Amino acid sequence: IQPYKPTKATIWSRADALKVNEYDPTTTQPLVSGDFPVMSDEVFIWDTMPLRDIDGNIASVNGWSVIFTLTADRNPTAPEYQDEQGNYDITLDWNDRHGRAKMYFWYSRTGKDWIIGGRVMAEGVSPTAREWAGTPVLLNERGEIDLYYTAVTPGATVVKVRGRVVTTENGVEMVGFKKVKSLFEADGKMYQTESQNPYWAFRDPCPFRDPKSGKLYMLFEGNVAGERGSHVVGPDELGDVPPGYEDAGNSHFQTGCIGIAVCRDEDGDDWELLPPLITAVGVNDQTERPHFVFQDGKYYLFTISHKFTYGDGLTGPDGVYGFVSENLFGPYVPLNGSGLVLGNPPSQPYQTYSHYVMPNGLVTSFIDSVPTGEDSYRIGGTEAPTVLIKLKGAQTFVLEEFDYGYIPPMIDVKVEH
C-alpha cells in the first residue's frame, strides 16, 4: 500500500476572501466602451458556450466556428415594458430573460462577426420551456453533438440531447436535437435541493475527459446540502482571519459549491454524483459556471460569481474566480491568493458576466450594463471584448484585449454525413 491523502472538498474560506483586491490591474477586465455594437436587433444573448470536444479543445467544423448562446426575445412592443411616457424600457425586458431562456447557435469562419442560426431544439422538444446553460460537445467526424444543458422549472436537472451539425459553404444548421435525456438532479445529502432551499442552484454542466485517467467527469454549480439556514460557519469556513474579523454575521446563508459527477461509460450516458470539489459556505452563495483549463500538469478550476452573493461582511467584484491543484480531486489553492482572476472594474461593476476561460488563454464574456453618464447606462445582451490571460503557477495575469466576441478555434474537425 501507497497511502494517498483522501479526497476532501477544498474550502474557499472567509480569510481567503478577505484578500480579494478589486483594484489590482493584473486581475481587472478592461473597460467596455459605451459605444459597443449589438449582435442582434431581435434577441438578447448572454451565456455563451463555444463548441468543443470532450478534451476541452474549442472546435470549428469544416472551418466554421460555432457558439451556443442562452437567448431571449426582445419585446419592444410589449405593454408590460412601456414606461409612464409610453416608451419601451429595455431594462425590464432584459431582466426577464432568464424566465424565457432558450438555446440558439451562431456561426462564423473568422471566430467573430457571428451569424445567427436560431434555435437548437425545436420549440417543445425541451421538457422545460426554460433552457439554461451547459456545454455543446462535438463527438465525432459525423458531426454528432451532445448538448449538455440545464432543464429548469420544475426543478433543475442536468440533461443532454444528441443532434448533429451540418455545414455548407454558406452556413451551419443544427439538426435532430429531439430526445432530451435526464442525467441527474440535486440529491439532498451532498447537494442542496429545492425542498431545502427555494433559491438553490443546480446548473451549468461542464463535461470533460480527465487528461490523466481518461475517465469522463462533469462539473456543475450547486449549493452544499442542508436546509437553508442550517449551515454553520465554523473554524474551517472562517479560516485564518485577522484580529477583529471573527464575526461571520449571517453568512451561513451563503452556501455555494462546485460539484462533480463521474460517468460509468465513454458516451456520457450514466452518471454518478460525487461530493463537491470546492465549497464556499460563509463566503459566496453562487459559484457559477465551473470549468477547467489543464496546463503544466495542473488543474485550473474557474468559477464565476457576483459581488451581491458574497457572505455577510465580505465583498469583491463580479467576475471570474479560480483555484489550482496538482490533482483533479485537490487540494486546490486560490489563484492570486484570494481566488480573484478577473474582476469587473469598480467604475463599471456590471459591465460583463458569465466569463469562460478557454485553454488558449482567451476569456469570453457577455455585456450586461455599461454606464454612460452619472445616471445613465446601456444594456448589452451581446458579446463583450475577449481578453487574454496567462496562468502561471498560482498566479494569473491579464494581457491583451481582443475584438467583441472573438472565440477562435483550437482545432478544426472535418465533418461528413
Coordinates of C-alpha atoms in Angstrom, one line a residue:
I1 CA 0.0 0.0 0.0
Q2 CA 0.9 3.5 -1.1
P3 CA -1.4 5.5 1.2
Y4 CA -2.9 8.6 -0.5
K5 CA -4.4 11.6 1.2
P6 CA -8.2 11.1 1.0
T7 CA -10.2 13.4 -1.3
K8 CA -11.9 16.2 0.6
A9 CA -13.6 19.4 -0.6
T10 CA -11.3 22.4 -0.7
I11 CA -12.8 25.2 1.4
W12 CA -12.7 28.7 0.0
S13 CA -12.6 30.5 3.4
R14 CA -13.7 33.9 4.7
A15 CA -9.9 34.6 5.3
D16 CA -9.2 33.8 1.6
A17 CA -12.0 36.2 0.6
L18 CA -10.6 39.0 2.7
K19 CA -7.6 39.0 0.3
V20 CA -9.8 39.9 -2.7
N21 CA -8.5 43.1 -4.3
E22 CA -10.9 45.0 -6.5
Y23 CA -8.1 47.4 -7.6
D24 CA -5.5 45.1 -9.0
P25 CA -4.6 45.9 -12.6
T26 CA -3.4 42.4 -13.3
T27 CA -6.8 41.0 -12.4
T28 CA -9.2 43.6 -13.8
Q29 CA -11.2 43.3 -17.0
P30 CA -10.5 46.1 -19.5
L31 CA -13.2 48.8 -19.6
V32 CA -16.0 48.1 -22.0
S33 CA -16.8 51.2 -24.3
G34 CA -20.2 52.8 -24.1
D35 CA -20.4 52.6 -27.9
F36 CA -20.3 48.8 -28.1
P37 CA -22.0 47.1 -31.1
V38 CA -25.0 44.8 -30.6
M39 CA -25.2 41.5 -32.4
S40 CA -29.0 41.2 -32.8
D41 CA -32.0 43.5 -33.0
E42 CA -34.3 40.6 -32.4
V43 CA -32.8 38.7 -29.4
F44 CA -30.7 39.2 -26.4
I45 CA -27.8 36.8 -25.8
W46 CA -25.9 36.1 -22.6
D47 CA -24.1 32.9 -21.5
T48 CA -22.0 31.8 -24.5
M49 CA -20.9 28.2 -24.9
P50 CA -18.3 27.5 -27.6
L51 CA -18.5 24.2 -29.4
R52 CA -15.7 21.9 -28.1
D53 CA -14.5 18.4 -27.9
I54 CA -14.6 16.3 -24.8
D55 CA -10.9 17.2 -24.1
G56 CA -11.7 20.9 -24.0
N57 CA -10.5 21.9 -27.4
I58 CA -12.6 24.7 -28.9
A59 CA -13.7 23.3 -32.3
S60 CA -14.6 24.5 -35.7
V61 CA -16.4 22.2 -38.2
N62 CA -15.4 22.4 -41.8
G63 CA -13.9 25.8 -41.0
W64 CA -17.0 27.2 -39.2
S65 CA -16.7 28.3 -35.7
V66 CA -19.8 27.6 -33.7
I67 CA -21.1 29.0 -30.4
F68 CA -24.3 28.2 -28.5
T69 CA -26.0 31.0 -26.5
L70 CA -28.7 31.5 -24.0
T71 CA -31.1 33.6 -25.8
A72 CA -34.3 35.6 -25.2
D73 CA -36.6 37.5 -27.4
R74 CA -36.6 41.3 -27.3
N75 CA -40.1 42.5 -26.8
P76 CA -40.1 46.3 -27.7
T77 CA -43.9 46.4 -28.2
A78 CA -45.0 44.6 -25.1
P79 CA -47.4 46.8 -23.0
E80 CA -45.7 45.4 -19.9
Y81 CA -42.5 47.2 -20.9
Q82 CA -43.9 50.6 -21.7
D83 CA -43.0 53.3 -19.1
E84 CA -45.3 56.1 -17.9
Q85 CA -44.5 58.1 -21.1
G86 CA -45.3 55.2 -23.5
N87 CA -41.6 54.4 -24.1
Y88 CA -40.1 50.9 -24.1
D89 CA -37.9 50.1 -21.1
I90 CA -35.2 47.7 -22.2
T91 CA -34.1 47.0 -18.6
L92 CA -37.4 45.2 -17.7
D93 CA -37.2 43.1 -20.9
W94 CA -33.5 42.3 -20.2
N95 CA -34.2 41.4 -16.5
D96 CA -37.0 38.9 -17.7
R97 CA -34.6 37.0 -20.0
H98 CA -34.0 34.1 -17.6
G99 CA -37.6 33.1 -17.4
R100 CA -37.8 32.7 -21.2
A101 CA -34.3 31.5 -22.0
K102 CA -33.7 29.2 -25.0
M103 CA -30.6 27.8 -26.7
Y104 CA -29.5 29.4 -30.0
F105 CA -26.5 28.8 -32.1
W106 CA -24.3 31.1 -34.1
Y107 CA -21.5 30.6 -36.7
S108 CA -18.6 32.3 -38.4
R109 CA -15.5 31.4 -40.4
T110 CA -13.5 34.1 -38.5
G111 CA -14.4 33.4 -34.9
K112 CA -16.2 36.7 -34.7
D113 CA -18.9 38.7 -36.5
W114 CA -21.3 35.9 -35.7
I115 CA -24.2 34.9 -38.0
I116 CA -27.3 33.9 -36.1
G117 CA -28.6 30.3 -36.6
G118 CA -31.7 30.3 -34.4
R119 CA -33.0 27.6 -32.1
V120 CA -31.0 24.4 -31.5
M121 CA -34.1 22.5 -30.4
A122 CA -37.5 23.0 -31.9
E123 CA -39.9 24.6 -29.5
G124 CA -41.5 21.9 -27.3
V125 CA -38.6 19.4 -27.5
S126 CA -37.2 20.5 -24.2
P127 CA -39.1 19.1 -21.2
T128 CA -38.9 22.6 -19.7
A129 CA -39.6 25.8 -21.7
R130 CA -36.5 27.2 -19.9
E131 CA -33.2 26.0 -21.4
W132 CA -30.4 27.1 -19.1
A133 CA -26.6 26.8 -19.7
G134 CA -24.2 23.9 -20.3
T135 CA -21.8 22.6 -22.9
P136 CA -22.1 21.5 -26.6
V137 CA -19.7 18.6 -27.0
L138 CA -18.7 17.7 -30.6
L139 CA -18.3 13.9 -30.6
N140 CA -17.1 12.7 -33.9
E141 CA -16.5 13.2 -37.6
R142 CA -20.1 12.6 -38.5
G143 CA -20.8 15.9 -36.7
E144 CA -22.7 14.4 -33.8
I145 CA -23.0 16.7 -30.8
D146 CA -24.1 16.0 -27.2
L147 CA -25.6 19.2 -25.8
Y148 CA -25.4 19.1 -22.1
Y149 CA -27.7 21.7 -20.5
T150 CA -29.9 22.6 -17.5
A151 CA -33.6 21.9 -17.8
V152 CA -35.2 24.4 -15.4
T153 CA -38.7 24.6 -13.9
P154 CA -40.0 22.3 -12.4
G155 CA -36.7 21.7 -10.6
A156 CA -33.3 22.0 -12.1
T157 CA -31.9 18.9 -13.9
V158 CA -28.7 18.3 -15.8
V159 CA -29.8 16.8 -19.1
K160 CA -28.4 16.1 -22.5
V161 CA -29.7 15.9 -26.1
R162 CA -28.0 14.4 -29.1
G163 CA -28.1 16.1 -32.5
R164 CA -25.8 16.9 -35.5
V165 CA -24.1 19.9 -37.0
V166 CA -24.4 20.1 -40.8
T167 CA -22.4 22.6 -42.8
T168 CA -22.4 24.1 -46.3
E169 CA -20.2 26.8 -47.8
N170 CA -23.0 29.3 -46.9
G171 CA -23.5 28.3 -43.2
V172 CA -24.4 25.9 -40.5
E173 CA -27.5 24.1 -39.3
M174 CA -28.3 22.1 -36.1
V175 CA -30.4 19.1 -36.9
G176 CA -32.1 16.2 -35.0
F177 CA -31.9 17.5 -31.4
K178 CA -35.1 15.7 -30.5
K179 CA -34.7 13.5 -27.4
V180 CA -33.7 15.0 -24.1
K181 CA -32.3 12.6 -21.6
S182 CA -32.3 13.2 -17.8
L183 CA -28.9 12.7 -16.2
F184 CA -29.1 13.9 -12.6
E185 CA -30.5 16.5 -10.2
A186 CA -29.6 17.5 -6.6
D187 CA -29.7 14.7 -4.2
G188 CA -30.1 16.4 -0.8
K189 CA -27.2 14.8 1.1
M190 CA -24.4 16.2 -1.0
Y191 CA -26.0 18.9 -3.0
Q192 CA -28.9 21.1 -1.8
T193 CA -32.4 20.6 -3.2
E194 CA -35.3 22.9 -3.9
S195 CA -37.1 21.3 -0.9
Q196 CA -34.2 22.5 1.3
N197 CA -33.8 26.0 -0.4
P198 CA -36.3 27.6 -2.8
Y199 CA -33.2 29.6 -4.1
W200 CA -31.0 26.5 -4.6
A201 CA -28.6 26.3 -7.6
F202 CA -28.0 23.2 -9.7
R203 CA -26.9 24.1 -13.2
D204 CA -24.1 24.7 -15.7
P205 CA -22.8 21.2 -16.6
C206 CA -19.2 21.1 -17.9
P207 CA -18.3 17.5 -19.0
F208 CA -14.7 16.7 -19.6
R209 CA -12.3 13.8 -20.1
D210 CA -9.7 13.9 -17.4
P211 CA -6.3 14.2 -19.1
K212 CA -4.5 11.9 -16.6
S213 CA -7.0 9.0 -16.2
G214 CA -9.0 9.3 -19.4
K215 CA -12.2 9.0 -17.3
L216 CA -15.2 11.2 -18.0
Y217 CA -16.4 13.6 -15.3
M218 CA -18.6 16.7 -15.2
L219 CA -18.5 19.9 -13.1
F220 CA -21.7 21.8 -12.2
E221 CA -22.8 24.6 -9.8
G222 CA -24.6 23.6 -6.7
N223 CA -25.1 24.5 -3.0
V224 CA -24.0 22.5 0.0
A225 CA -26.8 20.1 1.1
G226 CA -28.9 21.0 4.1
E227 CA -31.9 23.1 5.0
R228 CA -31.4 26.8 4.2
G229 CA -30.2 28.5 7.3
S230 CA -28.9 25.3 9.0
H231 CA -25.3 25.5 7.8
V232 CA -22.6 26.6 10.3
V233 CA -19.7 28.9 9.6
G234 CA -17.2 27.1 11.7
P235 CA -13.4 27.4 12.1
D236 CA -12.6 25.9 8.7
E237 CA -15.1 28.1 6.8
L238 CA -13.9 31.2 8.7
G239 CA -10.2 30.3 8.1
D240 CA -7.3 32.2 9.4
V241 CA -9.0 35.6 9.8
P242 CA -7.1 38.6 11.3
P243 CA -8.0 40.2 14.7
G244 CA -11.4 41.9 14.6
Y245 CA -12.6 39.9 11.6
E246 CA -14.0 36.9 13.6
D247 CA -17.8 37.8 13.1
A248 CA -19.4 35.6 10.5
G249 CA -22.7 37.5 10.6
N250 CA -25.5 35.7 8.8
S251 CA -23.1 34.3 6.2
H252 CA -24.3 30.8 6.9
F253 CA -26.9 31.6 4.3
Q254 CA -24.3 31.6 1.6
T255 CA -23.5 28.1 0.6
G256 CA -22.2 27.8 -2.9
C257 CA -20.2 24.8 -4.1
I258 CA -18.6 23.4 -7.2
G259 CA -19.9 19.9 -7.7
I260 CA -18.6 16.9 -9.7
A261 CA -20.0 13.8 -11.2
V262 CA -18.4 10.7 -12.9
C263 CA -19.6 8.7 -15.8
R264 CA -19.8 5.0 -15.9
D265 CA -19.1 4.9 -19.7
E266 CA -17.3 6.7 -22.5
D267 CA -20.5 8.1 -24.0
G268 CA -21.6 10.3 -21.2
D269 CA -24.8 8.3 -20.6
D270 CA -24.9 7.2 -17.0
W271 CA -23.6 9.4 -14.3
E272 CA -22.9 9.2 -10.5
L273 CA -22.8 12.2 -8.2
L274 CA -19.6 12.7 -6.2
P275 CA -19.1 15.1 -3.2
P276 CA -18.1 18.7 -4.0
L277 CA -14.7 19.8 -5.2
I278 CA -14.9 23.3 -3.7
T279 CA -17.2 24.7 -1.0
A280 CA -17.8 28.4 -0.1
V281 CA -20.0 28.3 3.0
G282 CA -19.9 31.7 4.6
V283 CA -18.2 33.1 1.5
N284 CA -20.4 33.1 -1.6
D285 CA -23.7 31.7 -2.5
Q286 CA -23.1 31.4 -6.2
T287 CA -20.0 29.6 -7.7
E288 CA -21.4 29.6 -11.2
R289 CA -20.2 28.0 -14.5
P290 CA -17.3 25.9 -13.2
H291 CA -14.8 24.9 -15.8
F292 CA -11.3 23.6 -16.2
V293 CA -8.1 24.6 -18.0
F294 CA -5.5 21.9 -17.9
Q295 CA -2.0 23.4 -18.1
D296 CA 1.5 22.5 -16.9
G297 CA 0.2 19.2 -15.5
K298 CA -2.2 21.2 -13.2
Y299 CA -5.9 21.7 -12.9
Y300 CA -7.1 25.3 -13.1
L301 CA -10.7 25.4 -11.9
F302 CA -12.6 28.6 -12.7
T303 CA -16.0 29.8 -11.4
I304 CA -18.0 33.0 -12.0
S305 CA -19.5 34.9 -9.1
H306 CA -21.2 38.1 -8.1
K307 CA -20.4 40.9 -5.7
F308 CA -24.0 40.6 -4.4
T309 CA -23.8 37.0 -3.4
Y310 CA -20.8 37.4 -1.1
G311 CA -21.1 36.4 2.5
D312 CA -22.1 38.9 5.0
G313 CA -19.1 41.2 5.8
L314 CA -17.1 40.3 2.6
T315 CA -17.0 41.8 -0.8
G316 CA -15.4 41.6 -4.1
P317 CA -16.3 42.1 -7.8
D318 CA -18.4 40.3 -10.3
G319 CA -16.2 38.2 -12.4
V320 CA -14.1 35.1 -12.6
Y321 CA -12.5 33.4 -9.6
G322 CA -10.3 30.3 -9.6
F323 CA -8.2 27.7 -8.0
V324 CA -5.3 25.4 -8.9
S325 CA -4.4 21.9 -7.9
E326 CA -1.8 19.3 -9.0
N327 CA -4.7 16.7 -8.9
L328 CA -8.2 16.6 -10.1
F329 CA -9.6 15.9 -6.6
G330 CA -7.4 18.5 -4.9
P331 CA -6.2 20.0 -2.8
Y332 CA -6.9 23.3 -4.5
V333 CA -5.4 26.7 -3.6
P334 CA -6.9 30.1 -4.5
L335 CA -5.4 31.8 -7.5
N336 CA -3.6 35.0 -6.7
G337 CA -4.0 34.3 -3.0
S338 CA -7.7 35.4 -2.9
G339 CA -9.2 33.5 -5.8
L340 CA -9.9 36.5 -7.9
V341 CA -8.8 36.1 -11.5
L342 CA -10.7 38.7 -13.5
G343 CA -12.9 41.2 -11.8
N344 CA -15.0 43.9 -13.4
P345 CA -13.6 47.4 -12.8
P346 CA -15.3 49.2 -9.9
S347 CA -16.3 52.1 -12.2
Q348 CA -18.3 49.6 -14.4
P349 CA -19.0 46.8 -11.9
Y350 CA -21.7 45.0 -14.0
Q351 CA -20.1 45.5 -17.5
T352 CA -19.7 41.8 -18.2
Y353 CA -20.6 38.4 -16.9
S354 CA -20.6 34.6 -17.4
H355 CA -16.9 34.5 -18.4
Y356 CA -15.4 31.4 -19.9
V357 CA -11.7 30.9 -19.8
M358 CA -10.6 28.8 -22.7
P359 CA -7.4 26.7 -22.9
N360 CA -5.7 29.2 -25.2
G361 CA -6.0 31.8 -22.5
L362 CA -8.8 33.7 -24.1
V363 CA -11.7 34.7 -21.9
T364 CA -15.1 35.4 -23.5
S365 CA -18.0 37.2 -21.7
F366 CA -21.2 39.0 -22.5
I367 CA -22.0 42.7 -21.9
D368 CA -24.6 43.3 -19.1
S369 CA -24.7 47.0 -18.1
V370 CA -22.3 49.8 -19.0
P371 CA -22.6 53.3 -17.5
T372 CA -22.8 56.2 -20.0
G373 CA -23.1 59.1 -17.5
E374 CA -23.6 59.9 -13.9
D375 CA -27.1 58.4 -14.0
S376 CA -27.5 56.7 -17.4
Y377 CA -26.4 53.2 -18.7
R378 CA -26.8 50.9 -21.7
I379 CA -27.8 47.3 -21.7
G380 CA -25.8 44.8 -23.6
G381 CA -27.2 41.3 -24.3
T382 CA -24.3 40.9 -26.8
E383 CA -20.7 39.7 -26.7
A384 CA -18.0 41.6 -24.8
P385 CA -14.4 42.1 -26.0
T386 CA -12.4 38.8 -25.5
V387 CA -9.4 39.2 -23.2
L388 CA -6.2 37.1 -22.9
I389 CA -5.0 35.9 -19.5
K390 CA -1.8 34.0 -18.6
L391 CA -1.8 31.3 -15.9
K392 CA 1.5 30.9 -14.1
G393 CA 1.7 28.6 -11.1
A394 CA -0.9 30.0 -8.6
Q395 CA -0.9 33.4 -10.3
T396 CA -2.9 34.9 -13.2
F397 CA -2.2 38.0 -15.3
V398 CA -4.5 39.9 -17.8
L399 CA -2.6 40.6 -21.0
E400 CA -4.4 41.9 -24.0
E401 CA -7.9 42.8 -25.3
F402 CA -9.4 41.4 -28.5
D403 CA -12.5 42.2 -30.5
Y404 CA -16.1 41.7 -29.4
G405 CA -17.0 38.0 -29.2
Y406 CA -13.7 36.8 -30.6
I407 CA -13.7 33.0 -30.0
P408 CA -11.1 31.4 -32.4
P409 CA -10.9 27.6 -32.8
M410 CA -8.2 25.4 -31.3
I411 CA -8.9 22.5 -33.7
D412 CA -10.9 22.0 -36.9
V413 CA -12.9 18.9 -37.4
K414 CA -13.8 17.6 -40.9
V415 CA -17.4 16.6 -40.8
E416 CA -19.2 14.5 -43.4
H417 CA -22.5 12.8 -43.2

